Write a protein that binds this DNA or RNA. Sequence first.
RNA 1: CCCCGGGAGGGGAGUGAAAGAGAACCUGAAACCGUGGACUUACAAGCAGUCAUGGCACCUUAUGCGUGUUAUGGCGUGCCUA
RNA 2: CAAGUGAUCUACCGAAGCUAUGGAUUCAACUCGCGAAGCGAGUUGUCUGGUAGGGGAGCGUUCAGUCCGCGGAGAAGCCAUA
Lengths: 69, 128, 98, 143, 117, 58
Amino acid sequence: MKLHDLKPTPGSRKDRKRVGRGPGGTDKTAGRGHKGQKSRSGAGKGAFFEGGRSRLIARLPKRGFNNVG
Amino acid sequence: ATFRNKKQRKQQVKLRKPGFAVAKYVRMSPRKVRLVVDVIRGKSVQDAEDLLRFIPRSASEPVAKVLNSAKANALHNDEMLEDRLFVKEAYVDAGPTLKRLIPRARGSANIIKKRTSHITIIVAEKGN
Amino acid sequence: MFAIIQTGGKQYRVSEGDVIRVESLQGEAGDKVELKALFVGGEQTVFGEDAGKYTVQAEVVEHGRGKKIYIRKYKSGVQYRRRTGHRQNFTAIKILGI
Amino acid sequence: KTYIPKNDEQNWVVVDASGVPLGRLATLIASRIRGKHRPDFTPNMIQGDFVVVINAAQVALTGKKLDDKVYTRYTGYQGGLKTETAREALSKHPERVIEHAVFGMLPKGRQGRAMHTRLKVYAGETHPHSAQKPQVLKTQPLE
Amino acid sequence: PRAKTGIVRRRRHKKVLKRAKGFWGSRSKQYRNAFQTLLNAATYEYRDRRNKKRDFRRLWIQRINAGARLHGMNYSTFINGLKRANIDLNRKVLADIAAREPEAFKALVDASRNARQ
Amino acid sequence: AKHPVPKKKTSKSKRDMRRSHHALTAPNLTECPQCHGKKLSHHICPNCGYYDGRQVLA
RNA sequence: CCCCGGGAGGGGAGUGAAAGAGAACCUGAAACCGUGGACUUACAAGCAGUCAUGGCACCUUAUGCGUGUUAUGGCGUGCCUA
RNA sequence: CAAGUGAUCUACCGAAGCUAUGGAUUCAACUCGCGAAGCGAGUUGUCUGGUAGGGGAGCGUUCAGUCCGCGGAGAAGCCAUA
Ligand SMILES: [Mg+2]
Ligand SMILES: [Mg+2]
Ligand SMILES: [Mg+2]
Ligand SMILES: [Mg+2]
Ligand SMILES: [Mg+2]
Ligand SMILES: [Mg+2]
Ligand SMILES: [Mg+2]
Ligand SMILES: [Mg+2]
Ligand SMILES: [Mg+2]
Ligand SMILES: [Mg+2]
Ligand SMILES: [Mg+2]
Ligand SMILES: [Mg+2]
Ligand SMILES: [Mg+2]
Ligand SMILES: [Mg+2]
Ligand SMILES: [Mg+2]
Ligand SMILES: [Mg+2]
Ligand SMILES: [Mg+2]
Ligand SMILES: [Mg+2]
Ligand SMILES: [Mg+2]
Ligand SMILES: [Mg+2]
Ligand SMILES: [Mg+2]
Ligand SMILES: [Mg+2]
Ligand SMILES: [Mg+2]
Ligand SMILES: [Mg+2]
Ligand SMILES: [Mg+2]
Ligand SMILES: [Mg+2]
Ligand SMILES: [Mg+2]
Ligand SMILES: [Mg+2]
C-alpha cells in the first residue's frame, strides 16, 4: 500500500514539551516561577516534622491460599 | 551584443579594466594614504605627478608609483592619449593587518596593529 | 465632493469607481441605489430630507482585498509580543445616479 | 482625501491696541497668526497672517497690573541674574510687552518660532509697511 | 543527529534588518538594536492606528467652526443647529469639504440658524 | 585602571564629525622659469638646481 | 613574451569551459573601512521611532501603485533581569 | 473690560467605554456528507487585557524510510525585491 499513506491513529502520538524556546509559550523560567527551584533536585516524601511519624504495630510473616470461588 | 546564457558570455567576453592599477598590500595605514590620495583625486595626471613630488608624506611615494601604472596601462595596454589623462577615480582600502603583541607596564601585553593598504587608482581621457 | 461617508454615501461625484466596506452584491449585480444627504448635481443642492427624495444608483465594479497590514502588539518588561496578519475586504462601486 | 491647500496668499492686517487689555489683544493676534480664522487646513503649514500692531505703547493693563506685572529674565550667569522689569517699564520698549504676550500664546516648536516672524509691533500710531496695505481688523467676535 | 543553527538565524535577522530601512545609525545595521527599536515601534504603530482618527476628527472640527465663524456662528452653535434640522447627519469630514465650497456651507449655516430661532 | 575614561563609544558620525579639519593642503606649485619643471616658491628648482643663476649640482 | 616599479603589486598576452579558477587560489554572509550617485542638512533641545501631510526622485512581485528620500505637524520614558 | 467665585440653564468638545459598517477567533444550540462519534463546515446568540501557570492548534532545522521529481541550457548556499 502507500507507505507514504500510512497514518498513525490520531491521538496516540503527542508532541513533547520543548521548554525553553521563546515567549510563544513557557518562556524565561521554564514553568518554574522564579524560585528555590533549581537544577539538582532533592526530595519526594519529606517535610521536617515528618508526620508519617505515627507509631507501628508489627508482624513479620504471612502465607496465603490461591482462591477458587 | 546579447548572449543566451552565462557560460558563453563568459567564454567570449573577457572584461577588462582600462586605466586601472592597484598597489596591493602596501605597509601603511589606509588613513594617511587616504590624505595623500584625496589631494590627488579628480586632477590632471601631470599635476598628480607634481603635487606628489612636493607633498611631504611618507605615503606620497607608493601613491606616486601606482599613479604611474595607471598612466602606463592607459598608454600601453589601453592605447589612450597621455596628454589627456586624468585621475577619474582613486581610493584606498584596507589590506590584512600585521598584529604584533608588545610588552607593557606591570606584566600586561598589548596588540599593535600594523595596517596595510590596497591603493588603487584609475585614469581616463578627461573629455567634457 | 462625493462622500463614502461612514458606510453609505451621499455626495455628488458623478461617474467614477470608489471603494466601500462590501456588499454581497455579486459581480456588477448590485446596482446599489443610494440615499443622498446632500449633493450638488446641478449647482443647486439641499439637505432637508429633500436629499432623501433624491437617490444615486451605482453599478458595482468588483470585490477586492485591501493592502496587507500586520497588527503588532507589545508591552514592556513582561515578554508579550504579538504579530498577526490582517487585511479587510471591500467592494468597488461605479457611480451613475441622479 | 481631506483637502490640503497650497498657499499663494499673503495676508497683511493692522490691529490697533489703544485701550485693549493686553491679554485680549494678544489672544486675537495669536489666533489670527496661527491660522484658526478661515478653515485652518493644514496645521503643518504657517498659513496664518502678518499682524501689524500699532499704538502698542497705549495698551491698557486693567487692575494693579501696571506695576504688579514683573516680567523676569535669566542671563546665563549664576551670579544672580533674574533681572525684572515692571511693565510700567514698558516705557523702555513697549513692543516687547506685546511681543511677549503673543509669543506665549503661540506654539513653542520649530514652526512656532518661525511664526514669531509674522508679528510686527510699533508703539506709535505709524508703521512703514504701507506697501502691503493691511486690512484693518476690529477686536472681538459676536456670539 | 546534530542540527546546528545553519540558515535559520541569519534569515530571521535579515528580516528584521530589512524592516530597518532608514533607521539612524546602528538602529538600522546592527540586529539587536534594530529588533529592540521595532519593539517600541510596535507600541507606536498600534496606538497611532487608533489615534489618527482622533486626529482627523480634530482637524475637521477646526475647519468647520472656522467656516461657522466666517458667518457669525461657531462649531457648538452650527453643529447643534444642523443637528436640530431634521438631523443632517453629514460627517464632520463632509462638512469640511463644504468649507471648500463656500456657497453651500453658507446655506447650511442659514439652515442651522433657522432650526434654532 | 585609568582615572578618566570615555563613557559611550563615539558614533561613526561624530567621529568623522571631528575629522572635517584634517584635509591636507596641496602645495602652491609653480613652473620653474628655466628647467621647465615644477618648484616650491622661495626655494631652489630641484630639477635644474637654478635660483636666478644656479647653485646646486645637477 | 611585453608594459610601470629596486621590489612588492599590478595591467596586457597566452593556457583553460571558466583567470567572474592565478597560487593571500571553491563559496565568500555580518560587523568594520572606503569610492561614486539620489534625496538632504549650518535658529537647532534629540530612546532617535510612529502616525499625517507637502516636496523631490525612480518605475523589472511596480503609475494609484507605490518605492527611496525629505520638510513640517502630532504623539512618544531603550532591552532584559529583579 | 473674569479667563476668579456661589447658585442656575443649556449647546458643544472629549476614551481603545457605547454605537455604525466590515471580518476573524472561543463556547453553545440548530442543518448537513457519513456507518461511528467527530471531522469539514453553514446560521444565530455569544466570547475574545493579562505576569507566574494549565490547555489547544501549528511554523521552521538536521537526519531516516517511501513517493514525486529537478539539475552543467546550471543544483545547494549567497544577494535584491513593492
Ligand atoms: Mg504550551
Ligand atoms: Mg531568574
Ligand atoms: Mg547541578
Ligand atoms: Mg579561448
Ligand atoms: Mg616584566
Ligand atoms: Mg516603556
Ligand atoms: Mg511588572
Ligand atoms: Mg473615538
Ligand atoms: Mg617582467
Ligand atoms: Mg610581477
Ligand atoms: Mg580577478
Ligand atoms: Mg572565484
Ligand atoms: Mg583574507
Ligand atoms: Mg598577490
Ligand atoms: Mg603574490
Ligand atoms: Mg570544485
Ligand atoms: Mg575564495
Ligand atoms: Mg566627488
Ligand atoms: Mg556618500
Ligand atoms: Mg534652517
Ligand atoms: Mg520627524
Ligand atoms: Mg468597544
Ligand atoms: Mg459587528
Ligand atoms: Mg458567528
Ligand atoms: Mg475585553
Ligand atoms: Mg487573552
Ligand atoms: Mg543556473
Ligand atoms: Mg546536504
